[PDB]
Structure formats: C-alpha cells, structure tokens
Amino acid sequence: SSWWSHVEMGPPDPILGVTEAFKRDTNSKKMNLGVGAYRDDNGKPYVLNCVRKAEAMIAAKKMDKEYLPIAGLADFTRASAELALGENSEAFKSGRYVTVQGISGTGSLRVGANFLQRFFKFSRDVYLPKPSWGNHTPIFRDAGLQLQAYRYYDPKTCSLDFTGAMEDISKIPEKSIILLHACAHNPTGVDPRQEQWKELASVVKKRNLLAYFDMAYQGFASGDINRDAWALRHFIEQGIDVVLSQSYAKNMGLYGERAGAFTVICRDAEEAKRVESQLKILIRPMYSNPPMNGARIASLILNTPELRKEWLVEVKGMADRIISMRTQLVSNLKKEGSSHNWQHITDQIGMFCFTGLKPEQVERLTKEFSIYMTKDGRISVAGVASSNVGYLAHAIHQVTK
Amino acid sequence: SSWWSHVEMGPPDPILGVTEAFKRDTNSKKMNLGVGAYRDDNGKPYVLNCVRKAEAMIAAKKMDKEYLPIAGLADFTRASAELALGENSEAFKSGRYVTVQGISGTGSLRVGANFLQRFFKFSRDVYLPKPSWGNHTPIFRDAGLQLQAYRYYDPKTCSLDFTGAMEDISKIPEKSIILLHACAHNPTGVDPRQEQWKELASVVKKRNLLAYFDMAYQGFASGDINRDAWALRHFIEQGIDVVLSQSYAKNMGLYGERAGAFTVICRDAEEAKRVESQLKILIRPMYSNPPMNGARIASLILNTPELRKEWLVEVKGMADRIISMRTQLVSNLKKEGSSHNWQHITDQIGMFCFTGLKPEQVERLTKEFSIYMTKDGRISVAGVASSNVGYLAHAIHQVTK
Ligand SMILES: *Cc1c(COP(=O)(O)O)cnc(C)c1O
Numbered sequence: 001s002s003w004w005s006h007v008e009m010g011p012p013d014p015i016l017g018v019t020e021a022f023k024r025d026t027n028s029k030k031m032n033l034g035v036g037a038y039r040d041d042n043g044k045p046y047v048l049n050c051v052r053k054a055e056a057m058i059a060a061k062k063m064d065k066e067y068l069p070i071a072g073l074a075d076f077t078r079a080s081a082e083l084a085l086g087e088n089s090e091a092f093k094s095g096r097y098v099t100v101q102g103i104s105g106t107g108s109l110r111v112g113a114n115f116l117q118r119f120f121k122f123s124r125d126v127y128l129p130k131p132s133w134g135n136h137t138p139i140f141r142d143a144g145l146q147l148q149a150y151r152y153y154d155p156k157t158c159s160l161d162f163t164g165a166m167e168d169i170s171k172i173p174e175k176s177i178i179l180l181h182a183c184a185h186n187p188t189g190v191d192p193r194q195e196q197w198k199e200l201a202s203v204v205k206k207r208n209l210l211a212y213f214d215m216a217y218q219g220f221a222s223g224d225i226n227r228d229a230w231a232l233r234h235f236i237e238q239g240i241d242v243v244l245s246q247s248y249a250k251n252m253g254l255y256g257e258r259a260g261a262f263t264v265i266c267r268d269a270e271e272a273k274r275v276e277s278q279l280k281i282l283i284r285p286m287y288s289n290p291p292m293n294g295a296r297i298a299s300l301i302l303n304t305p306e307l308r309k310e311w312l313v314e315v316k317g318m319a320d321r322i323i324s325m326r327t328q329l330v331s332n333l334k335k336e337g338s339s340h341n342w343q344h345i346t347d348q349i350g351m352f353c354f355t356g357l358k359p360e361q362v363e364r365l366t367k368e369f370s371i372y373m374t375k376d377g378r379i380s381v382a383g384v385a386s387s388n389v390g391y392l393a394h395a396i397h398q399v400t401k
Numbered sequence: 402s403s404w405w406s407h408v409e410m411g412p413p414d415p416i417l418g419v420t421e422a423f424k425r426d427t428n429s430k431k432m433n434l435g436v437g438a439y440r441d442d443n444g445k446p447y448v449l450n451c452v453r454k455a456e457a458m459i460a461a462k463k464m465d466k467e468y469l470p471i472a473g474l475a476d477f478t479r480a481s482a483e484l485a486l487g488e489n490s491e492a493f494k495s496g497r498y499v500t501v502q503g504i505s506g507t508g509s510l511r512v513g514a515n516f517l518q519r520f521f522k523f524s525r526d527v528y529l530p531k532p533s534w535g536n537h538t539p540i541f542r543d544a545g546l547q548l549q550a551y552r553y554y555d556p557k558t559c560s561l562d563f564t565g566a567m568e569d570i571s572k573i574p575e576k577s578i579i580l581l582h583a584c585a586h587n588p589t590g591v592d593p594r595q596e597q598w599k600e601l602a603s604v605v606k607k608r609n610l611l612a613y614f615d616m617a618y619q620g621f622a623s624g625d626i627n628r629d630a631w632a633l634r635h636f637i638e639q640g641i642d643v644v645l646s647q648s649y650a651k652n653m654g655l656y657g658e659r660a661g662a663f664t665v666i667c668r669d670a671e672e673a674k675r676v677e678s679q680l681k682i683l684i685r686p687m688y689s690n691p692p693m694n695g696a697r698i699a700s701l702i703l704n705t706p707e708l709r710k711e712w713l714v715e716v717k718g719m720a721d722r723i724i725s726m727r728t729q730l731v732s733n734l735k736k737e738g739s740s741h742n743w744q745h746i747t748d749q750i751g752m753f754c755f756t757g758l759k760p761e762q763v764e765r766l767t768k769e770f771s772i773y774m775t776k777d778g779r780i781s782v783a784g785v786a787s788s789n790v791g792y793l794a795h796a797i798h799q800v801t802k
C-alpha cells in the first residue's frame with residue numbers, strides 16, 4: 001500500500017472558517033457577512049415562489065429520469081441563449097451561437113476553459129481583473145492555461161481604476177483571452193459604467209482579444225435582466241464574438257440544483273455546429289451528460305409566460321433588498337457621526353461589497369461585535385437585514401472612528 | 402471573428418446512428434437493442450416506486466436549494482460507502498475510506514482519473530480490459546494518463562480469456578493502475594467467476610498494482626447487492642486498497658439526476674482526511690459542488706428502512722426480468738432448431754450481451770428483421786421483452802443457420 005503517504009493536508013478555506021467560527025458564537029447580536037448566497041430579511045434561505053410552482057408542474061407530469069443529450073435540455077439551452085443575447089439579437093436570430101448546459105456557472109466556465117485549451121491556438125494567456133473571484137485562478141490553471149492580470153479595482157477610491165484598466169488592456173498581446181465579469185463584479189461590487197464599457201469594447205475590438213464573459217448575476221444585480229446584460233450585448237453588437245458562462249444559482253436561487261450554460265458566438269450556423277460537435281466530445285469524458293433537475297425548473301420558468309413574469313418580480317425583489325441594505329448602511333453610518341466617505345457602498349452593485357476596511361479593523365469587528373467577514377474587507381450584503389443594519393453601522397463606526 | 406474556422410466537425414456516434422435508423426423504421430416489429438438504459442416489459446422507461454416516494458417526501462419537507470458541501474451530501478456519501486463496502490467491513494468501521502459525491506459514475510471516474518494524474522507518482526499507465534466501455538479511453542486520456550490493455554474477452558467462446566488475462570496481468574510492471582469492472586462487464590457481459598476473482602486478486606496483490614474498480618451495476622447484475630460487490634470486497638479483504646467509482650444511474654434508475662460517488666481506500670482515518678482535502682481542491686475548479694436532487698433521492702432510500710427494503714425488491718425485479726430474457730432467448734433458439742451453442746447468452750451478466758454474431762449477420766438482422774444493434778454483435782438486453790423474445794430467437798436462427 002502506502003499509495004497516499006505523501007499526500008498532504010491542503011490549505012484551509014477562509015470563507016469556510018468564518019462561517020464555522022460564526023457558528024460557535026454565542027452573541028445573539030452576531031452576524032455572518034461571509035455567506036455566498038442570498039438571504040431574506042429574516043436571514044433565511046429563499047426558494048422563489050415561481051420555483052415552487054415549476055416543481056409542482058414537473059411533479060404533476062410524472063416525468064421520466066432518462067439521460068439528457070450530452071449538450072443538455074434543448075428547451076433550456078435555447079432559452080438560456082435567448083435570456084443572455086436578447087430576443088431580437090442578430091446573433092440569436094441567425095443561429096450563429098452554440099449553447100451547451102453546464103453544471104451551473106462553475107462547470108460552464110471549466111468546460112469553456114477546457115475548450116480554449118484545446119482549440120484556441122492563438123494563445124495560452126488568460127487575463128483576469130485584479131482582483132477576481134478566487135475560483136477563477138484554479139479553473140483556468142487546471143484547464144492548462146496561463147494566468148495574467150489587468151488593473152481593475154482602485155484601493156485608493158474603492159472604485160474602478162479605469163485609467164489603469166485602459167492602459168493594461170491596450171498593452172495586452174493581440175489575440176489573448178480576457179475575462180470580464182458582466183455585472184456585479186466579485187469580489188468588489190465595482191462595475192464599469194455604460195460609458196466606460198463602450199470604451200473597453202473599443203480597445204478589446206482593437207487588440208482583437210477573445211472576450212470571455214462570466215455572467216453569474218443577470219437580473220440579480222440591478223433587478224433588470226436587460227440592463228444587467230447590457231455590456232455583453234454591446235460587445236456582440238460591436239462585432240466582438242465572445243464566449244460566455246451563465247449561472248442560474250443566484251437569479252433563480254437554484255444553488256444546489258446546478259443549472260448553467262456555456263455559449264460560444266460563431267461566425268455562422270455552420271461553424272456553430274462544428275464547435276458544438278467538439279464541445280460534446282469534450283463533455284462526454286468529463287461527466288457524460290448534465291443533471292436534469294435544475295434545467296427542467298429553469299426551462300419551465302423561462303418558457304412559461306406566467307412563471308417568467310412572476311420570476312422577474314421576484315428577482316427585482318431580491319435586487320431591491322440588497323440595494324436597500326447598501327442605502328441603509330450608508331445613512332446609518334452618517335447618522336452615527338462617521339466622517340469617512342462611504343459612497344462606495346452605494347456605488348457598488350450586487351451581493352459583494354469591498355468596504356475598504358483594513359484587516360486589524362475586521363479583527364476588531366469579529367472580536368468585539370461578533371461580525372464575521374473575510375480579512376479583505378469583503379462583506380456579503382446578503383447577510384445584512386433591516387433588523388441588524390443599525391448594529392453593523394455602529395460597529396463599523398466604532399472600529400473606524 | 403474567425404476564431405473557430407479550424408475546428409473540424411467531430412466524428413459521428415455509431416450508437417446514435419443505430420437509434421436514428423430505428424426511429425425512422427415503420428415496421429411495428431422493430432426492436433432497439435442499442436438502448437443503454439433499462440426498459441420494462443412494455444419497452445418503456447421505468448422510474449422506481451421507491452424513487453417516486455422519496456421525491457414526494459422531499460417536496461413535503463419544503464427543503465431549500467442551498468449549495469451542498471464540495472464533497473457532497475454527507476448522508477449520501479456515508480450510505481454510498483456502506484453500500485459498496487458492507488456494514489461490517491473493516492474498512493468502513495475504521496473510517497479509513499474517503500467518499501466524495503461525483504456527477505454519476507462518469508464524473509466519479511473522471512474525478513478519480515484527475516486525482517491519479519495529480520498524486521499517483523508511481524506510474525501514468527492505466528490498463529483496461531479488451532474490450533472496455535468506450536468512454537473509458539477518453540476519460541483517462543483527457544485526464545493525462547497513458548492507456549494500456551490486458552486480454553479479457555475470448556471471441557472463440559464468447560467468454561473469459563482467463564489464460565490470456567492472467568498472462569498479461571503477470572507482466573504488468575509493479576505499481577501500475579488496473580481498471581476492473583466490479584460486475585456486469587460493459588460491453589460483453591462476461592464477468593470472472595468467484596474462483597477466477599480469487600486468482601486475479603492474488604496477482605494484483607503480488608504485483609502490487611493499484612486496482613481501480615468501476616461499479617456501475619451493483620444490485621442490477623444479479624439482483625443481490627452483496628453478491629454484486631463480492632469481488633470489490635474480496636480485494637479489500639486481501640489487503641488491496643482500491644479506488645472505486647459507483648453509479649446509481651441504473652440500480653436506482655436515477656439516470657438524468659446524476660448521482661454517483663468516488664471512493665479511496667486509505668491506510669487510516671488520518672490519511673483519509675488528507676486525501677479528502679486534496680479531492681476538494683480538485684473538485685472546486687471542476688464544478689464547485691454537486692447536483693443535489695439525485696443525492697437527496699438516493700440518501701433517502703438508503704437511509705430509510707422502509708424505502709430501502711422496497712428498493713431491494715425493485716432492483717431484484719429489474720435483474721430478474723433481464724435474466725428471464727436471456728433464459729427465454731436461449732430456449733427459443735433451441736426451439737427454432739438452432740444447432741449452435743448459445744450458452745454464453747445465459748452465462749453473461751447484466752445489461753449487455755456479446756452474441757458472437759458477425760457484422761454481416763448484424764446487417765441482415767437490421768435489413769431483414771428491423772432489429773437494431775451495433776456491428777460488434779453487442780445487444781442491450783433491456784430492449785428484449787416477453788412479447789418479442791420469440792421474434793428475436795427467430796431472426797437469430799435465420800441469420801446463423
Ligand atoms: C457564483 C459565481 C459563478 C457561478 O457559481 P455557480 O454556483 O457555480 O453557478 C461564477 N462566477 C462568479 C464570479 C460567481 O460569483
């Protein structure tokens with residue numbers, strides 16, 4: 001034996017550690033700001049009503065559990081493309097796209113990474129924003145690509161280093177791969193404004209880079225599915241043929257069901273089919289075919305007018321609660337007599353917020369107020385409720401005064 | 402742009418090719434023996450009663466859709482290890498195993514392949530039986546391992562080439578990897594008998610090879626979960642610390658839900674925690690966390706005495722039907738006056754049967770009898786029903802007489 005004696009204990013996960021440490025807390029006051037999923041005003045997981053409705057519909061039909069095609073549920077992939085691209089989008093209407101179901105957003109990103117490793121002969125380099133979601137690194141590295149970075153977040157203003165971004169991108173070698181977060185940047189919450197986006201599109205076009213969009217928060221960011229996909233649609237319209245990963249984890253609250261899709265924009269329908277054949281060859285030896293549950297739910301919702309309609313109301317409802325918490329934290333910090341500038345809290349979008357707090361401060365927060373978050377000053381706004389926003393503002397004020 | 406112009410259309414799937422021809426056919430006597438899933442006596446997909454019950458139970462509980470841990474549902478992984486190893490297994494009781502949820506058997510196989518590529522310093526060679534399930538090749542190849550083979554099937558007798566298998570295995574360099582089908586060999590249906598298994602274990606032990614078991618048909622093969630896992634259990638008892646992939650796709654009819662597991666037998670519980678850490682690190686960047694539906698269903702069945710009892714009756718029913726079909730086919734052949742030896746049909750186990758028919762005979766069966774199968778003479782026993790076993794016997798006689 002002794003096959004594994006040399007296998008060492010891997011590094012402990014920080015996110016994991018704050019939740020765990022949060023749990024062993026006795027403060028009734030305590031708060032978990034490291035939670036990566038949406039929570040209602042009561043701090044509870046939220047299953048959408050449109051989701052429960054779709055499940056009752058599925059149940060009623062007494063559906064089989066037979067394998068889906070390698071590429072996934074056709075009603076799902078089509079609807080997914082439609083949601084992303086837009087109903088009257090030329091890319092959509094001509095059928096010059098290829099969409100395959102992936103295991104949520106992460107599985108979709110990996111499939112894409114693997115596809116690029118295999119067929120993107122022009123380069124091995126992937127440029128991630130500084131910083132980006134931690135998983136981005138291993139996804140691409142494991143796939144066999146090299147990681148590079150472009151300036152993005154400005155720690156001085158807790159906003160976008162637009163100038164730094166433009167300078168870096170301008171210098172990226174032609175035909176390199178650039179990863180862009182479609183909206184609700186993770187982990188900062190800092191997104192380019194529509195006008196900066198047009199400028200970014202132009203440089204990307206000029207450098208003839210392959211733009212890879214990570215779209216995990218469509219609709220969940222601003223409450224508007226069209227506005228959330230604006231940037232993506234802009235690049236395509238500018239004639240940039242992107243690659244994209246979509247997640248239904250957050251926008252439909254499908255977390256554990258794992259529904260997502262990977263899309264490639266091709267020159268034509270003919271090319272899309274060639275590309276499609278190769279994606280199938282790639283997926284087979286990965287997991288054979290995708291999990292059916294989440295795809296069935298998502299497909300029902302997107303394809304049934306009445307459910308799609310209720311869905312839009314509910315996503316807006318989630319986006320609104322987050323926006324409300326941001327607004328309330330700022331007002332409450334002001335009311336406390338805080339002299340610092342906290343406008344970044346309201347300028348930021350989505351679930352994550354880069355507070356600008358320093359590590360020793362985060363520490364004071366955990367130690368004396370029972371407020372759990374990562375040492376990078378990142379807080380999950382999902383963890384803030386109307387009932388504790390006051391408490392958090394006070395604590396923050398105390399530690400920063 | 403023209404990023405994908407050099408992407409060639411991938412080769413067509415012959416199996417799919419067989420199903421499409423089948424579908425076109427207007428002869429009401431047509432048979433599809435190219436089907437890779439269980440079919441009832443009426444030729445329909447079958448969702449187990451215990452599955453319907455578990456589902457209803459889940460709905461009733463209004464469970465959330467929160468992310469499962471990376472390694473999967475703990476209740477599912479424990480129950481999965483228990484099923485494979487046996488309740489009173491030393492490996493199990495001592496907790497010297499590590500089980501992680503995978504995307505059905507395929508995903509689990511791949512996770513394992515990736516784990517070997519990363520940590521199995523001793524060799525890059527994986528020896529597969531001749532022949533093996535088609536997907537085995539690219540699974541190991543995509544993972545970065547080298548493929549080798551050992552003689553397994555004997556076309557002379559449509560049975561095991563024991564002499565050849567033993568000779569090949571005896572020449573495998575120490576510390577190489579050998580893939581073994583736990584039961585219901587895919588695609589021949591030829592499995593070693595107990596005595597043969599004892600000899601094989603002795604050699605694997607002696608040459609100190611890492612045994613990788615693919616267990617996709619536990620309970621489905623003979624209708625007895627204990628008997629089906631006999632060989633895997635025997636290896637472990639002999640002091641061979643194996644690696645194993647389990648699938649619930651067939652035994653539970655979970656197909657599309659993708660419920661499976663990957664297990665590593667370790668020296669001790671300590672070593673298992675280390676290996677588990679490394680498995681989590683590998684999985685995150687693949688798909689983050691596993692699909693919940695299938696696991697929930699499978700856990701409920703295994704962990705609920707009433708449901709479990711019911712499942713055993715149902716899996717037995719499935720296996721029984723298949724054995725009955727093999728039985729009926731053989732007697733009907735004699736009945737038609739087939740002088741030939743068709744004992745292999747009954748000696749073979751599981752879903753697949755290598756008939757020994759030649760390509761030209763297969764063509765005649767398709768062309769003249771509207772009986773669809775692959776040219777290797779492989780038949781899916783699931784496609785045979787009480788209503789058509791007679792016809793098949795008939796057609797076989799005609800083409801071999
Ligand atoms: C959540 C998220 C994804 C997708 O997550 P899944 O649960 O795998 O769908 C992808 N990228 C980012 C940046 C995310 O925050």
Ligand SMILES: *Cc1c(COP(=O)(O)O)cnc(C)c1O
Pocket residue numbers: 287288504505506507508534587615617648649650656661
């Ligand atoms: C079915 C099967 C598997 C697992 O298939 P999944 O649908 O991915 O669970 C693995 N190996 C063999 C030989 C099989 O026949």
